Amino acid sequence: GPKFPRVKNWELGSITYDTLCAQSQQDGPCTPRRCLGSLVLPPAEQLLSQARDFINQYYSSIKRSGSQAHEERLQEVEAEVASTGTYHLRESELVFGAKQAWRNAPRCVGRIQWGKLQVFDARDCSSAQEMFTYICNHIKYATNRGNLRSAITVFPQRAPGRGDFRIWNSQLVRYAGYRQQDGSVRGDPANVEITELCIQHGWTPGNGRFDVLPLLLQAPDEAPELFVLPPELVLEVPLEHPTLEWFAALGLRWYALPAVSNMLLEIGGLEFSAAPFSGWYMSTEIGTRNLCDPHRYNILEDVAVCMDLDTRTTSSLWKDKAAVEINLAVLHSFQLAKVTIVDHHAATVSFMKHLDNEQKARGGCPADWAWIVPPISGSLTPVFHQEMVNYILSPAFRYQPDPW
Amino acid sequence: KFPRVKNWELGSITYDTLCAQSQQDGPCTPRRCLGSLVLPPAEQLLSQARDFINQYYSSIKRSGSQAHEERLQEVEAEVASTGTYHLRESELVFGAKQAWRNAPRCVGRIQWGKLQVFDARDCSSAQEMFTYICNHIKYATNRGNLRSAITVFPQRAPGRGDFRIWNSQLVRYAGYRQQDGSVRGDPANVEITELCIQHGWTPGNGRFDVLPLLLQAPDEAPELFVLPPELVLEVPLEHPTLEWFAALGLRWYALPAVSNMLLEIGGLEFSAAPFSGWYMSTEIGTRNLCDPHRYNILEDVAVCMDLDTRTTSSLWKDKAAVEINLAVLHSFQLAKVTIVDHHAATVSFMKHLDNEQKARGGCPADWAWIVPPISGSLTPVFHQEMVNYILSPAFRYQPDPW
Numbered sequence: 104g105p106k107f108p109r110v111k112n113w114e115l116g117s118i119t120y121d122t123l124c125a126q127s128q129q130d131g132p133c134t135p136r137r138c139l140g141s142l143v144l145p146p147a148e149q150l151l152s153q154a155r156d157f158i159n160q161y162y163s164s165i166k167r168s169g170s171q172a173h174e175e176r177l178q179e180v181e182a183e184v185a186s187t188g189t190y191h192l193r194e195s196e197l198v199f200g201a202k203q204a205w206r207n208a209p210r211c212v213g214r215i216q217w218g219k220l221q222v223f224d225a226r227d228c229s230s231a232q233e234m235f236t237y238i239c240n241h242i243k244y245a246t247n248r249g250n251l252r253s254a255i256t257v258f259p260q261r262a263p264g265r266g267d268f269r270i271w272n273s274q275l276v277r278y279a280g281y282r283q284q285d286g287s288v289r290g291d292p293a294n295v296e297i298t299e300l301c302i303q304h305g306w307t308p309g310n311g312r313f314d315v316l317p318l319l320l321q322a323p324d325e326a327p328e329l330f331v332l333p334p335e336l337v338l339e340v341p342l343e344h345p346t347l348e349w350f351a352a353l354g355l356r357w358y359a360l361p362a363v364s365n366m367l368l369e370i371g372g373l374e375f376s377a378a379p380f381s382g383w384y385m386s387t388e389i390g391t392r393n394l395c396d397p398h399r400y401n402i403l404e405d406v407a408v409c410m411d412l413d414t415r416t417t418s419s420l421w422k423d424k425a426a427v428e429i430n431l432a433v434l435h436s437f438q439l440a441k442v443t444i445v446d447h448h449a450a451t452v453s454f455m456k457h458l459d460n461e462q463k464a465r466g467g468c469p470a471d472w473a474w475i476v477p478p479i480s481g482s483l484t485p486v487f488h489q490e491m492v493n494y495i496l497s498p499a500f501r502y503q504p505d506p507w
Numbered sequence: 508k509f510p511r512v513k514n515w516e517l518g519s520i521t522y523d524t525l526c527a528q529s530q531q532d533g534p535c536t537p538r539r540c541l542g543s544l545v546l547p548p549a550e551q552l553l554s555q556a557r558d559f560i561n562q563y564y565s566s567i568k569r570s571g572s573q574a575h576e577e578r579l580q581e582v583e584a585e586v587a588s589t590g591t592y593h594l595r596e597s598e599l600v601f602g603a604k605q606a607w608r609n610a611p612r613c614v615g616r617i618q619w620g621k622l623q624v625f626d627a628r629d630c631s632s633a634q635e636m637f638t639y640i641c642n643h644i645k646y647a648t649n650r651g652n653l654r655s656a657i658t659v660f661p662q663r664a665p666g667r668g669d670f671r672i673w674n675s676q677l678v679r680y681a682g683y684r685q686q687d688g689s690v691r692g693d694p695a696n697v698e699i700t701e702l703c704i705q706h707g708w709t710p711g712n713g714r715f716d717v718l719p720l721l722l723q724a725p726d727e728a729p730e731l732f733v734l735p736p737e738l739v740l741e742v743p744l745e746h747p748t749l750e751w752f753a754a755l756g757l758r759w760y761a762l763p764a765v766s767n768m769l770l771e772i773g774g775l776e777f778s779a780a781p782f783s784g785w786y787m788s789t790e791i792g793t794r795n796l797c798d799p800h801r802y803n804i805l806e807d808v809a810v811c812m813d814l815d816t817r818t819t820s821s822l823w824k825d826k827a828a829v830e831i832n833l834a835v836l837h838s839f840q841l842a843k844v845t846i847v848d849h850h851a852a853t854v855s856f857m858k859h860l861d862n863e864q865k866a867r868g869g870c871p872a873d874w875a876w877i878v879p880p881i882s883g884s885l886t887p888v889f890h891q892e893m894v895n896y897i898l899s900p901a902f903r904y905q906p907d908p909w
């Protein structure tokens with residue numbers, strides 16, 4: 104074959120060549136000498152070239168590449184950058200850019216859905232209070248009484264010598280994590296720092312395991328302001344198991360809406376520092392990671408004890424048995440509650456379909472194997488057996504430093 | 508810059524400095540990561556040779572000695588006259604252990620210093636190869652108390668064909684392709700099965716027929732050798748509580764022994780150098796029995812358990828897999844054959860990472876291979892960042908001989 108990465112599926116014996124990776128402008132963490140794939144954490148004329156590239160992507164997406172409108176838009180952008188140092192996206196350009204950022208996200212297994220994204224344009228927002236209103240609207244629309252809908256809300260872009268719009272919280276919904284006197288944590292240990300930041304900024308803390316955090320919202324060059332979500336806007340699912348009656352007695356729950364709020368959306372050189380987006384959960388994110396990680400709720404031993412498993416020897420597979428029942432409880436409870444959720448089998452089958460769609464549409468799909476393969480039952484899903492090429496395309500969602 | 512390597516469960520950071528010692532490239536470039544891929548003159552030989560001799564004398568703390576200097580002259584003298592050289596037995600022993608230590612895909616490396624090395628470099632015929640292989644199997648098997656071992660046959664030489672073992676492992680079950688494309692037995696072994704028959708083997712018709720070995724002395728047709736049934740220890744599979752499981756008629760062999768890899772030491776290449784340890788239960792329970800392109804028994808077990816097969820959200824697949832793994836562990840424990848579960852194995856690997864950090868300043872590891880195929884995030888290795896790179900001595904893939 105050709106001189107592009109050859110990609111193999113070991114289950115089916117089929118081969119593809121990734122030619123899309125040629126479009127990658129930005130380097131990842133690896134070199135010839137060493138693979139750094141498993142690592143969680145990897146303008147002037149510079150703006151113009153990123154902007155030109157994005158405008159070319161837009162016009163090609165609407166099959167008007169080389170058109171008069173295409174060439175006029177290019178001239179517009181360079182003139183605007185020439186005089187002001189920056190430029191602004193048309194509305195349809197933002198919608199295209201946000202969908203493309205999602206389509207481009209190598210860590211997202213949900214990308215079959217990429218073309219179905221509600222884009223709320225909030226580039227008119229001028230205060231923290233209005234951010235909150237926009238966010239509540241997002242949450243209401245996206246939650247939709249359990250019939251979840253993917254959405255993103257985009258706040259004003261970064262601007263030269265003016266402060267950023269930032270949502271301080273890592274997600275729109277987060278449970279408090281309260282550091283105890285003994286040094287243990289009540290609630291979610293992932294959220295200890297954001298919890299202590301909320302208190303420093305005047306929040307009156309609770310002391311439950313599932314206290315919903317307020318939002319800390321920052322408008323340009325202002326201290327962040329604190330906003331409590333009205334509890335009726337935050338849909339949650341109490342967890343029960345279909346046959347283990349005691350599981351409901353554990354008082355476990357999770358919220359419906361996974362909504363990432365700390366990522367930067369980059370489109371044609373422009374940087375949207377506040378641009379929260381939401382989808383629906385894959386069940387392993389809740390049942391395996393959030394509930395069973397040792398550094399999260401860590402409930403495995405408790406569930407195993409209730410199941411009367413032999414927790415004293417690794418070889419009884421007590422961890423695997425408990426984890427499976429916890430995942431089942433998550434699925435069953437969301438289903439009973441009528442809240443959209445997808446299991447890791449159905450999600451990974453749909454990601455394989457996505458890989459085939461993108462092979463034909465673009466000649467490849469950037470994908471992070473370690474993130475795509477679910478954290479339980481890996482080789483039981485078709486993605487385990489699929490080789491993947493990881494690279495950065497733009498538009499992109501990127502990590503950005505915390506605002507404090 | 509040297510890689511920062513973080514453990515996300517403990518918050519601890521190390522820096523890998525061992526990777527600087529890498530000379531051969533992996534598949535990745537700055538543009539794109541290819542880490543998930545399964546398949547990625549005299550002065551050149553001389554520099555690899557010297558570097559390996561330096562590794563050796565350093566390992567015995569005699570670096571810079573008379574012995575060291577003289578050995579470097581011997582190697583130099585032999586390469587300059589003949590284009591090649593030969594290893595002393597003790598250097599071979601050191602290189603074999605180092606190749607294993609360096610194997611990025613191996614979760615069992617806490618064991619690396621405990622390897623029995625059989626020198627089979629005085630082998631001159633397929634007949635002799637078979638004798639050496641039977642001794643390896645008998646030693647390694649040890650009536651169920653498994654012992655890691657490697658047997659090293661003669662190195663590649665410029666003027667001739669290679670010594671090769673055609674089979675990918677020393678023990679493999681036949682796969683018989685049916686007229687309608689389906690397979691009886693192990694679908695992974697269809698090609699070696701046909702090669703065996705074609706070289707004269709009378710085939711069986713079972714799901715677990717142990718294959719003969721095809722052994723090749725240089726520039727000769729391979730020869731067929733049936734392993735004596737008493738040499739191949741096997742474990743019938745049953746479940747501690749599910750009575751019908753035994754009725755599935757399942758079984759696996761005790762001894763995992765890879766026989767198709769090339770061992771490279773100091774620039775010299777050992778095209779036949781089979782090595783063996785003991786199994787991690789997920790290799791059998793998860794991959795060999797449940798891969799859809801392997802024995803693919805998930806659905807049969809699910810039905811036997813009376814699971815709801817009609818929907819993925821019942822997690823029938825996850826439930827059947829767990830019980831299959833449990834049966835493997837139980838059965839091996841019952842038969843007194845060494846096995847390690849994925850929790851104990853990954854915990855030991857974490858200890859190995861820490862040992863290697865102190866000893867060498869790093870450890871090459873291939874995350875996708877180290878994390879087990881079920882319950883990944885339930886093991887500590889899932890949460891550990893890892894740097895993959897090629898050090899020498901090394902085990903490598905090589906082309907199939909046919």
Ligand code: HEM
Pocket residue numbers: 201205208210211212213214216220253254255363380381382383384385388445450474500
């Ligand atoms: C439609 C339902 C969706 C499902 C089932 C889904 C599934 C997932 C899963 C399972 C992860 C890994 C999360 C983890 O390990 O914590 C993920 C990560 C990601 N997803 Fe999707 N997703 C969906 C919608 C979306 C939407 C609407 C966007 C953006 C528009 C998106 C962009 C991302 C990004 C950027 C990451 C990486 C997060 C990070 O690095 O912190 N996802 N998603």
Ligand code: HEM
Pocket residue numbers: 603607610612613614615616618622655656657765782783784785786787790847852876902
């Ligand atoms: C002591 C018992 C051992 C255990 C439990 C162990 C564990 C493993 C496991 C689980 C794999 C991945 C296998 C797969 O996914 O198919 C592996 C691969 C490997 N192991 Fe170890 N191992 C052990 C001994 C050894 C020994 C003695 C050597 C060499 C002297 C070795 C070298 C390798 C190599 C080269 C691979 C990669 C094989 C390939 O790429 O096909 N292992 N081992």
Ligand SMILES: Cc1cc(N)nc(CCCCCO[C@H]2CNC[C@H]2Cc2cc(C)cc(N)n2)c1
Pocket residue numbers: 143213361362363365366380381382383384385388502503
């Ligand atoms: C939109 C959406 C859908 C869906 N099903 N799931 C999600 C949740 C993704 C949340 C990912 C959280 O990532 C954190 C916690 N684990 C790894 C770490 C990676 C990371 C680091 C940083 C600095 C930021 C960030 N967003 N993500 C989001």
Ligand SMILES: Cc1cc(N)nc(CCCCCO[C@H]2CNC[C@H]2Cc2cc(C)cc(N)n2)c1
Pocket residue numbers: 545675763764765767768782783784785786787790904905
């Ligand atoms: C020593 C040892 C211990 C232990 N627990 N397990 C083993 C067996 C390792 C089996 C390796 C099988 O690898 C093949 C089949 N799946 C991935 C593929 C990788 C590969 C490709 C090629 C060309 C050769 C090769 N040896 N391995 C060996």
Ligand SMILES: C[C@H](O)[C@H](O)[C@H]1CNc2nc(N)[nH]c(=O)c2N1
Pocket residue numbers: 141142143473474475515889890891892893
């Ligand atoms: C060290 C390792 O990269 C890390 O634990 C990764 C592995 N795979 C993952 N996969 C997903 N989806 N999410 C994660 O947070 C992680 N964590």
Ligand SMILES: C[C@H](O)[C@H](O)[C@H]1CNc2nc(N)[nH]c(=O)c2N1
Pocket residue numbers: 113487488489490491543544545875876877
């Ligand atoms: C495509 C992907 O890399 C491939 O399926 C790998 C994943 N991880 C693995 N890990 C181990 N131990 N053995 C394997 O064969 C594989 N296969």
Ligand SMILES: [Zn+2]
Pocket residue numbers: 133137138139140535539540541542
């Ligand atoms: Zn890489």
